[model samples]
Target: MIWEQHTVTLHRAPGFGFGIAISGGRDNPHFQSGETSIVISDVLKGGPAEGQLQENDRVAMVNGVSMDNVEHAFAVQQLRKSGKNAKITIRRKK
Candidate 1:
């Protein structure tokens, strides 16, 4: 089946990398699990994060720490502080 489920496992970037993994977009009032989510646009795939990141994201977690439904900037902070084996978790909007 095509487009049955949605997910991606983006490899980490080098040095303060792939935190937001996105750029040039604002949070919108979109539905995901419920109301209260932001929509990030204009991904900077050309940036350090590279192609792994995409044009839009609703980052749910990072480096084992829950995002607390936070924004990209703060999430980036969480990522930077992550140890060598950093990880990120994301999901599609319903």
Candidate 2:
């Protein structure tokens, strides 16, 4: 089994507003696992993650799942295919 050791948190993916930014391609280290991840670059004010998620936070998962073990369309598909909300695990900036 794949080894994971980060503290996980459940985040409901944009129920209304979670203006996320992702500006990387296959060469990005974050996407090497197939599960693409980007920083919480900017949060739309009064959005779902306005206060809950902050900029620079290293997003590690969506819907409680990790990337290192998933496929190209695995993570996103699972999140959208099931719930109105999604969760995220992170390695908060220190």
Which candidate number would show the highest lDDT if scored against the true structure? Answer: 2
Candidate 1 collision pairs: 28-39
Runs of candidate 2 exceeding 4 Å displacement: 1-17, 24-37, 69-82
Candidate 1 clashes: the total is 1
Per residue, candidate 2 scores C-alpha lDDT tens digits across 1-94 of 3433244333444554334443222335344454345444566676655666666565566665654444434544544554545566655645
Best by TM-score: 2
- lDDT at 40, model 1: 37
Error in Å for residue 24 of model 2:
4.4
- Of candidate 2, the 10-residue stretch with the lowest lDDT total is 17-26
Where does model 1 exceed 4 Å of error?
1-12, 19-51, 71-73
Q: Assess candidate 2 and give its TM-score to the true structure.
A: 0.52
